[PDB]
Swiss-Prot record, chain A:
Keywords: Acetylation, ATP-binding, Cytoplasm, Nucleotide-binding, Nucleus, Phosphoprotein, Proteasome. This is 26S proteasome regulatory subunit 10B. The keyword Repeat does not apply. Pfam families: AAA, AAA_lid_3, Prot_ATP_ID_OB_C. GO terms for molecular function: ATP binding; ATP hydrolysis activity; identical protein binding; proteasome-activating activity; protein-macromolecule adaptor activity. The gene is PSMC6. Belongs to the AAA ATPase family. InterPro entries: 26S_Proteasome_ATPase, AAA+_ATPase, AAA_lid_3, ATPase_AAA_core, ATPase_AAA_CS, NA-bd_OB-fold, P-loop_NTPase, Prot_ATP_ID_OB_2nd. The modification Phosphoserine is found at residue 217. Component of the 19S proteasome regulatory particle complex. The 26S proteasome consists of a 20S core particle (CP) and two 19S regulatory subunits (RP). The regulatory particle is made of a lid composed of 9 subunits, a base containing 6 ATPases including PSMC6 and few additional components. Interacts with PAAF1. One of its GO terms (biological process) is proteasome-mediated ubiquitin-dependent protein catabolic process. The keyword DNA-binding does not apply. One of its GO terms (cellular component) is nucleus. It comes from Homo sapiens. ATP binds at residues 147-154.
From Swiss-Prot, chain B:
The chain holds residues 72 to 293 of 439 of the full protein. It comes from Homo sapiens (Human). Belongs to the AAA ATPase family. It comes from the Eukaryota. This is 26S proteasome regulatory subunit 6A. Sumoylated by UBE2I in response to MEKK1-mediated stimuli. ATP binds at residues 137-144. Component of the 19S proteasome regulatory particle complex. The 26S proteasome consists of a 20S core particle (CP) and two 19S regulatory subunits (RP). The regulatory particle is made of a lid composed of 9 subunits, a base containing 6 ATPases including PSMC3 and few additional components. Interacts with PAAF1. It is found in: Cytoplasm; Nucleus. It is linked to Deafness, cataract, impaired intellectual development, and polyneuropathy: An autosomal recessive disease characterized by early onset of deafness, cataract, severe developmental delay, and severely impaired intellectual development. Patients later develop polyneuropathy of the lower extremities, associated with depigmentation of the hair in that area. Component of the 26S proteasome, a multiprotein complex involved in the ATP-dependent degradation of ubiquitinated proteins. This complex plays a key role in the maintenance of protein homeostasis by removing misfolded or damaged proteins, which could impair cellular functions, and by removing proteins whose functions are no longer required. Therefore, the proteasome participates in numerous cellular processes, including cell cycle progression, apoptosis, or DNA damage repair.
Length: 362, 203
C-alpha cells in the first residue's frame, strides 16, 4: 500500500510546491506606453491614471512595445516587465459569448423578405466581398430592425446569431450604461475595438432607443452623459476611421424617438420593418407554434387567422399557450379547435389594453 | 513538508482579502489581468491558489492585499438592495382569506404555480407555460393581497421588487438592479418576481 500512498503524497507534493511558487509571486500594474525617450526611459501611464517615466527590463524587444501598447510595470519600481495584447473587457467577452439558443430560420414565420434583407446586409458581403467590388459599391453596414412589440426582431437576431459563423456581439443598449464618468463611451469604444480586432464581426444592439434616443437641448446631466455615449457610438460607426467587415444590427420598437444622426443612411443603412403578421404570416406563425401541441381534431387555422387580425407573433404563441391552458383546465391531454377559438378570443380581449403601435422612423 | 507548506500557504492566505475581478485570462502557462475594488488593474503572472480553468472574465475573486495574488473565488454580487427585496419570513394568508376573487385566483395560481409543480402536464401537451401575469385592478380589489397569498402558499423563492425601488439616479443603476434581481431569481430554485405598482417603472 506504501506505493500508492507515497504516489498520492508525491502528487500532492507537486501541487503544494506549485502553490508555494505561485505564492512567492506578486502582481504587476498594467499600463500603456505613450512614448520612448532614451532607450531606457518610457513614458507609461498606469490604467489608474498617473503617468510616469519608467525603465525597461532588458529582454523586451523595445520594437514590440510602441505607443499605445499595454505593458506590465513592476509594482515597486514601475519598470516595464512585459508587453501585453489589447485588453478585452469582461463585458465585451460575455457580449461575444452569450448563447443565442439554437434558433433556426425555420422558427421565423412571415419574415421572409426581411430575413433575406438582413442576410443580404450581413452574410453575403462577408463571404463574397468581390461581387460588390465589381458592381462598384461598398455593401451596407447597418441594419435597423424596427417594428411593433413582439413582431420578431429579437427572434430574427437570435436566428442570425445562431446560423452565421463570423464573430457576433450580443448587447442590450441599456446594459452598456454605467454611472461612472465616460464609462459607457469607453465600453462602446472597446466594443468596436474588439470588433476591429476580430475583423469579420457583427454587433447586435437590442432596443437601441435605450442609448440612441434623441438628443435633448434641455436635458439633465444623465441625459448629457448618455448623449456622449450615443455620439461615441455614432463616431464609431461612421466617424473618421472607416469600419471594415464590421456590421451593425439594431432592434427597436420606438424608432420615432431615435436620433436623426443615428437613423442617418450612413450609419443605419437599411431600416427594415418587422410589421405585424399579415394573413399568411399569421398562418405560418400559428402553424409553427402549434406544431408541437398534440392536436386531436380538425384545425381551421384559417378561422384562427381570421380572428387573429391585428395580432403579433407573440400573441399567436400566446394563443397556442392559452389553448393549452384551456386543455389543462378541462383536464384534457390534447387541444381542439374549440380551445383554439376560445384562446384567440381571449387574446383578442387582452389586446384591448394596448396603445399606438404603428411607430415609424423619420 | 505538506504540513509546513500548508502552514506557509495559510499564513499568506490569512484574512482579510481584497475582492477583485478576473477581467481577462491570458495565455503566456496562464495569467490573470485582475481588476481590484480599489479600482486598480493588476496583471498576475501566476493566477494563484485557485484553478486557472475555473476563472472566467468578470467573476469575483479574493486576492492578497500586497502580492495581489488570487486566493479564492467568491459568490456573485447582488446589490444588498436586490437581496433585501427577497421574501424570507413568508406571509401568512391562505387563499381562503381572499374574497370575491376566485376566477382571478384560479388564473394566477395556474399560470404561476402549475408550471412549477406540474410541469409534466405542459411537457406532455407540448406547450410553453405562460410567462408573465399582470394583475390590473382599480385602487382596491385584491392584487397585492393575492400576491401575498401566492407568496405564502407557493413555497418557492419569492422576490418582491415594487415599482419605485428600481428608479435611481446614477445612470446604469436601476438597470443593474433589474439585472441583479432576475439573476438572483434565476440562480435560486423556482422563483416568482412580484412587481408591485408596475406603472412607476413601466410608463
Ligand atoms: N415572426 C415570428 N415568427 C415566429 N415567432 C414569432 C415571430 N414574431 C414573434 N414571435 C414570437 O415572439 C416571441 C419573441 O419575440 P421577439 O423577442 O422576437 O420580439 P420583438 O419584435 O423583438 O419585440 P420587442 O419590441 O418586444 O422586443 C417568441 O415567442 C417568438 O416565437
Ligand atoms: N377580495 C378581497 N378579499 C379580501 N380582502 C380584500 C379583498 N380585496 C381587498 N381586500 C383588502 O384590501 C386590503 C389590501 O388591498 P390590496 O393591497 O390587495 O390592494 P391592491 O389591489 O394591490 O390595490 P392598490 O395597491 O392600488 O391600493 C386588505 O385589507 C385586503 O384584506
Ligand atoms: Mg426584442
Ligand atoms: Mg398594491
Amino acid at each position: 500500500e506504501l506505493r500508492e500512498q507515497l504516489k498520492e503524497l508525491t502528487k500532492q507534493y507537486e501541487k503544494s510546491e506549485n502553490d508555494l511558487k505561485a505564492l512567492q509571486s506578486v502582481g504587476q500594474i498594467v499600463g500603456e506606453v505613450l512614448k520612448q525617450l532614451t532607450e531606457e526611459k518610457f513614458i507609461v501611464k498606469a490604467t489608474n491614471g498617473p503617468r510616469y517615466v519608467v525603465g525597461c527590463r532588458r529582454q523586451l524587444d523595445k520594437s514590440k512595445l510602441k505607443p499605445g501598447t499595454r505593458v506590465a510595470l513592476d509594482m515597486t519600481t514601475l519598470t516595464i516587465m512585459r508587453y501585453l495584447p489589447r485588453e478585452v473587457d469582461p463585458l465585451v467577452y460575455n457580449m461575444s459569448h452569450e448563447d443565442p439558443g439554437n434558433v433556426s430560420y425555420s422558427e421565423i414565420g412571415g419574415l421572409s423578405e426581411q430575413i433575406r434583407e438582413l442576410r443580404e446586409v450581413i452574410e453575403l458581403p462577408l463571404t463574397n466581398p468581390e461581387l460588390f467590388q465589381r458592381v462598384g459599391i461598398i455593401p451596407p453596414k447597418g441594419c435597423l430592425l424596427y417594428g411593433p412589440p413582439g413582431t420578431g426582431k429579437t427572434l430574427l437576431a437570435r436566428a442570425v446569431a445562431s446560423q452565421l459563423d463570423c464573430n457576433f456581439l450580443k448587447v442590450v443598449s441599456s446594459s452598456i450604461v454605467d454611472k461612472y464618468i465616460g464609462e459607457s463611451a469607453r465600453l462602446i469604444r472597446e466594443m468596436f475595438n474588439y470588433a476591429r480586432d476580430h475583423q469579420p464581426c457583427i454587433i447586435f444592439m437590442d432596443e437601441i432607443d435605450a442609448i440612441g434616443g434623441r438628443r435633448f437641448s434641455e436635458g439633465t446631466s444623465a441625459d448629457r452623459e448618455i448623449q456622449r455615449t450615443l455620439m461615441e457610438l455614432l463616431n464609431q460607426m461612421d466617424g473618421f476611421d472607416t469600419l471594415h467587415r464590421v456590421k451593425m444590427i439594431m432592434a427597436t420598437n420606438r424608432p420615432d424617438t431615435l436620433d436623426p444622426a443615428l437613423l442617418r443612411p450612413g450609419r443605419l443603412d437599411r431600416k427594415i420593418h418587422i410589421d405585424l403578421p399579415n394573413e399568411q404570416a399569421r398562418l405560418d406563425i400559428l402553424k409553427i407554434h402549434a406544431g408541437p401541441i398534440t392536436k386531436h381534431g380538425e384545425i381551421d387555422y384559417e378561422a384562427i387567422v381570421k380572428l387573429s387580425d391585428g395580432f403579433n407573433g407573440a400573441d399567436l404563441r400566446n394563443v397556442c399557450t392559452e389553448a393549452g391552458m384551456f386543455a389543462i383546465r378541462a383536464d384534457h391531454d390534447f387541444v381542439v379547435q374549440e380551445d383554439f377559438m376560445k384562446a384567440v378570443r381571449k387574446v383578442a380581449d387582452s389586446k384591448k389594453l394596448e396603445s399606438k403601435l404603428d411607430y415609424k422612423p423619420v | 513538508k505538506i504540513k509546513e507548506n500548508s502552514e506557509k500557504i495559510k499564513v499568506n492566505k490569512t484574512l482579510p482579502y481584497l475582492v477583485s475581478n478576473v477581467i481577462e485570462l491570458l495565455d503566456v502557462g496562464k495569467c490573470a489581468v485582475i481588476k481590484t475594488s480599489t479600482r486598480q488593474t493588476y496583471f498576475l503572472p501566476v493566477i494563484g491558489l485557485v484553478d486557472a480553468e475555473k476563472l472566467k472574465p468578470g467573476d469575483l475573486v479574493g486576492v492578497n492585499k500586497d502580492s495581489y495574488l488570487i486566493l479564492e473565488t467568491l459568490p456573485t454580487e447582488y446589490d444588498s438592495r436586490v437581496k433585501a427585496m427577497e421574501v424570507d419570513e413568508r406571509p401568512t394568508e391562505q387563499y381562503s382569506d381572499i374574497g370575491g376573487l376566485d376566477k382571478q385566483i384560479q388564473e394566477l395560481v395556474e399560470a404561476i404555480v402549475l408550471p412549477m409543480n406540474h410541469k409534466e402536464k405542459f411537457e406532455n401537451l407540448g406547450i410553453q407555460p405562460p410567462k408573465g401575469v399582470l394583475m390590473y385592478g382599480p385602487p382596491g380589489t385584491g392584487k397585492t393581497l393575492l400576491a401575498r397569498a401566492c407568496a405564502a402558499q407557493t413555497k418557492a423563492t419569492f422576490l418582491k421588487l415594487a415599482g419605485p425601488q428600481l428608479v435611481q439616479m446614477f445612470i446604469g443603476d436601476g438597470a443593474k438592479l433589474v439585472r441583479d434581481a432576475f439573476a438572483l431569481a434565476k440562480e435560486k430554485a423556482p422563483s416568482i418576481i412580484f412587481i408591485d405598482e408596475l406603472d412607476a417603472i413601466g410608463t
